[PDB]
């Protein structure tokens, strides 16, 4: 909304993009890991329903 | 007692460099704002002939030579003291660089006020600051009215 | 040029003059009275920072009225298409005529009513059935609360005279769009703005040339026309 | 003469094409400002007597004026056989358009 | 026009559109990030006898 | 000290064209908000 200087504005679109689809879930192709404090992992969805008594 | 340390202070205008009388000169030439004769300027330095001083004087863009009586006179940027002329002014515009205010004031002292009064008047493209409404590099009016419609209804199209 | 397009530029002049702020209306005076800019010129000429200039570009993107153009000489530069100003325009007219109508069309029929209590909107035919036993008070399913009438019947005339005095000051605007309509639409280009090329200074680092590369094979977005 | 000038100025920046009547210019002339025919007869003598006057013998600057009181005499005293051309174009084939206004003496027989 | 080469790379997607519409070969391609809007509006553009091909 | 220094500034700039403002200290070493008006009547 605000001034775009054009090159914080493109991080701050995939950092959207990035958290949506670490919330959607955790398990991708392990480039990142994202976490959040403390160090035990965040746990998603895939998380909530995987095998070994994940909700199924 | 002061007058003996004024005139014990007051150094010859003989002085190390000639660009000190010069400043000297175009101050007391500043401070009047009617153009005076070169028997003040004898008076105010010591020199009586004309110089170099008194011809890079007449050479000086803000100091006018008199052919006629040898007045000598301030020459300001703008030579407009008028709304009119400063409405020509901005007609006359040829770009749209804003004009600074300083030297408004310099040959107009009451410029600002007539700024403030002519945007009241919706006369004038105005920049001024947040932390005051100031009288900055300004443009001609070619718009209808500034002040044109209520902030309710611009808030509307906002929200269109 | 065609006194039509100076219509058109008179009609945009207008719209931002009555509508828009007063530094939209100076850059986008400057932008006409000038031709396509370099920012460092423009900044220059206003003596601006670009933290000023950032949300009055970014209000002119989101109403779709100026074209950006990015080259190398890498050079910003600024026009505005003419086709996707004018449609812009048009939907914005059109959206405004048919939400103001909706607006008043609704505003017309009376309120409903207002609890205090929880705050929220109900209407008239919603509260037939929020009647109590003895049709003293209109009863409320949560707060066992009356329900008091709101102040929007008497807001009909006001949306009524809000649209009616819009279109007399929209009215030039009409007749210019009527105008437009009995002419021919024509497209900007950034070449287009550069033959119209208006110098604003002498020393532009910037060189208002539009130089694409050999093999220049791609079709880009709001950059080509079908 | 300085706010004649301004008319001629703002009537300079013309876009396209023009070719209007020297009773068309003075018809614009009285809608936008008050400069008058018979005045725009009499700028010349009245310019010429001024020189005269005033001994002004560096007319180096001057000399440009003698072109518009010519023009403003031979345009408010002929209105046929005449026609005043306007055009964006002084130079058509040049880097910018400089404008310019055209004066065309239609008939021979005059002189 | 062409369909750019699509490589996929972490969270989006590029193209490099070859084209190759100069007199010469001309193999120079722009890698572009393909932006969410665009894709969305060609998936607007899309027939529903293209869908049930598709199988959607 | 306004009339002396203004002289002894005109030596400066005779003696460099870009003379350091942080040079410009010692070579006054007086109030600098005095020496901050002087420095603007004249150059930079």
Redesign the interface.
């Known amino acids: 909304h605000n001034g775009a200087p054009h090159h914080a504005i493109e991080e701050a679109e995939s950092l959207l993009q990035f958290h949506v689809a670490t919330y959607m879930d955790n398990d991708i192709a392990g480039q990142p890991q994202a976490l959040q404090k403390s160090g035990r992992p965040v746990k998603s969805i895939r998380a909530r329903l995987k095998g070994k008594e994940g909700r199924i | 007692i002061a007058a003996a340390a004024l005139q014990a202070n007051q150094?010859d205008i003989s002085?190390?460099?000639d660009?000190?009388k010069l400043?000297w000169a175009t101050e007391y030439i500043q401070k009047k704002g009617k153009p005076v004769l070169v028997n003040e300027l004898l008076d105010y330095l010591s020199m009586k002939k004309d110089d170099k001083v008194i011809e890079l004087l007449k050479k000086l863009d803000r100091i006018e030579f008199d052919p006629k009586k040898g007045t000598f006179k301030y020459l300001s940027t703008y030579d407009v003291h008028s709304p009119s002329e400063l409405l020509k002014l901005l007609r006359?515009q040829v770009?749209?660089?804003?004009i600074s205010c300083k030297d408004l004031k310099d040959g107009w002292p009451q410029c600002d006020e007539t700024i403030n009064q002519l945007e009241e008047d919706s006369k004038i493209?105005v920049?001024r600051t947040k932390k005051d409404k100031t009288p900055r590099?300004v443009?001609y009016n070619?718009?209808?009215?500034?002040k044109?419609?209520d902030e309710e209804?611009?808030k509307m199209?906002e929200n269109? | 040029d065609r006194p039509i397009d100076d219509i058109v530029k008179n009609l945009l002049k207008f719209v931002v003059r009555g509508f828009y702020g007063g530094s939209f209306v100076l850059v986008l005076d400057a932008i006409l009275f000038h031709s396509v800019l370099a920012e460092d010129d423009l900044k220059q000429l206003l003596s601006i920072n670009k933290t000023e200039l950032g949300p009055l570009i970014a209000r002119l993107r989101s109403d779709r009225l100026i074209s950006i153009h990015k080259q190398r000489e890498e050079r910003v530069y600024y026009y505005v298409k003419y086709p996707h100003a004018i449609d812009a325009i048009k939907w914005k007219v059109h959206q405004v005529v048919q939400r103001l109508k909706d607006d008043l069309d609704k505003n017309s029929e009376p309120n409903g009513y207002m609890c205090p209590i929880c705050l929220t909107k109900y209407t008239q035919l919603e509260a037939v059935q929020l009647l109590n036993f003895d049709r003293t008070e209109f009863l409320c399913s949560l707060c066992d609360e009356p329900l008091v009438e709101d102040d929007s019947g008497k807001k009909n005339k006001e949306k009524q005279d809000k649209l009616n005095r819009l279109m007399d000051q929209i009215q030039p605007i009409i007749d210019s769009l009527k105008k437009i309509d009995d002419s021919r639409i024509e497209e900007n280009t950034f070449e287009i703005a550069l033959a119209r090329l208006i110098p604003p200074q002498n020393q532009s680092h910037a060189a208002y040339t539009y130089n694409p590369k050999k093999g220049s094979t791609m079709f880009r977005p709001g950059d080509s026309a079908p | 003469l300085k706010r004649l000038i301004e008319y001629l100025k703002t009537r300079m920046k013309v876009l396209h094409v023009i070719s209007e009547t020297p009773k068309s210019f003075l018809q614009h002339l009285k809608q936008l400002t008050f400069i008058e025919r018979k005045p725009l007869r009499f700028c010349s003598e009245r310019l010429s007597l001024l020189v005269r006057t005033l001994e002004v013998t560096e007319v180096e600057d001057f000399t440009a004026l003698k072109d518009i009181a010519t023009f403003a005499t031979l345009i408010s005293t002929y209105e046929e056989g005449f026609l005043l051309i306007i055009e964006p174009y002084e130079i058509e084939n040049a880097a910018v358009p400089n404008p310019i206004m055209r004066f065309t003496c239609l008939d021979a027989s005059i002189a | 026009n062409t369909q750019p080469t699509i490589r996929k790379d972490g969270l989006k997607l590029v193209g490099s559109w070859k084209k190759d519409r100069a007199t010469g070969d001309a193999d120079e391609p722009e890698l572009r990030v393909l932006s969410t809007e665009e894709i969305l509006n060609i998936f607007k553009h899309i027939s529903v006898k293209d869908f049930t091909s598709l199988g959607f | 000290p306004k009339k002396e220094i203004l002289d002894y500034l005109f030596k400066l700039f005779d003696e460099y064209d870009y003379w350091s403002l942080k040079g410009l200290k010692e070579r006054t070493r007086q109030p600098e908000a005095h020496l901050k008006e002087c420095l603007d009547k004249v150059a930079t």
């Open positions: 150094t002085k190390s460099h660009s000190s400043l006359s770009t749209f660089k804003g493209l920049l590099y443009w070619s718009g209808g009215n500034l044109c419609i209804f611009v199209w269109v």
